[model samples]
Target: GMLLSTDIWVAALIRRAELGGAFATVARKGDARAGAVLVKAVDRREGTARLFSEATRGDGERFWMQPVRSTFEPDLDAYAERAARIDPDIWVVEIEDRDGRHFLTEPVES
Candidate 1:
């Protein structure tokens, strides 16, 4: 959390994903390089998918919170606007997995 800009954070995450067998991206491509980051993504098994969002602990650190463990296509963006209302200047890097993985600890590829 020193000076890892949002863009840099994304590079790190993408490397983490590909090396781990998945991939990452920013869904909307906003103007956040060092902005207050939030997480939102879809995890998959080619069957069951899930939605994950950002959250933080009032005690110490940040958390990736998923309200609906089950994923759906409809009302997805609806969940997004809920965050905008908070005005945190979101840097949303989306992690999309093909095999139901977050790839947060995964390896990288070209």
Candidate 2:
């Protein structure tokens, strides 16, 4: 594996932080704002990830293909990477709106 530049590294770290923040936000608010927070966090991560992809056209294009869904959040990234490696033609995306029920929808606090 290759090491990312300072800027790229920082961006990914920030993205991770955003993801954690989103998770925390959802956990704290219960479920009402969960989807929105997850989407925002994922958006931040996606944008930063694309920048990291700019290095070589080989993997970069695959990064921006489309959106997808997952029953869980953390698995989304790992599964996406695995799928990309297995079939470069495929890229995975996790839409929080769809995943909300798993994380927030069912657990109505009231």
Candidate 3:
């Protein structure tokens, strides 16, 4: 059994977005081996946005979960920054789109 590197996955995701005409950036880099990654989708044109990350529910099923949502950039950015500070091994991916489409609805590698 083998696992993909976190750093590699992040780079791939960024590339994917770029190819699709979207923009991606690393807000805070974390461990490349086993860091937990968080995605923030910002849609300035749509006036909406949300922060997503993996979460295990009561049924033990892991899925992309939105722990926070906001219309203000400062609030969302601050929350993400605070989260990274709490977990040094946390990776933050910021995606910008015009229609709030981050293309992050697919299942992530576990």
Best by lDDT: 3
- The 10 consecutive residues of candidate 2 with the worst lDDT sum are 28-37
After superposing candidate 2 on the true structure, give the runs of residues whose Cα lies further than 4 Å from its correct spot.
Answer: 1-72, 98-110
Assess the local accuracy of residue 70 in candidate 3 as a C-alpha lDDT between 0 and 100.
Answer: 57
Clashing pairs in 2: none
List, residue by residue over 1-110, the lDDT tens digit for candidate 1: 36445567656776776676666766544445635444444556575555556456688455566764445655554666656567546655666677766654322211
For candidate 3, lDDT tens digit of each residue in 1-110? Answer: 54667697688878877666777887777899978788888887767777777676699555667766555778777878788777768888888977766666356432
Q: List TM-scores for all candidates, in order.
A: 0.63, 0.23, 0.79
Can you tell me which runs of candidate 3 are displaced by over 4 Å?
A: 57-61, 108-110
lDDT of 2 by residue, 1-110 (tens): 65433233233433554454433222211122111111122444443221011112465321222233433445545544554454424312232322231122111120
Q: What's the alpha carbon RMSD for model 3?
A: 3.5
Clashes of each: 5, 0, 0
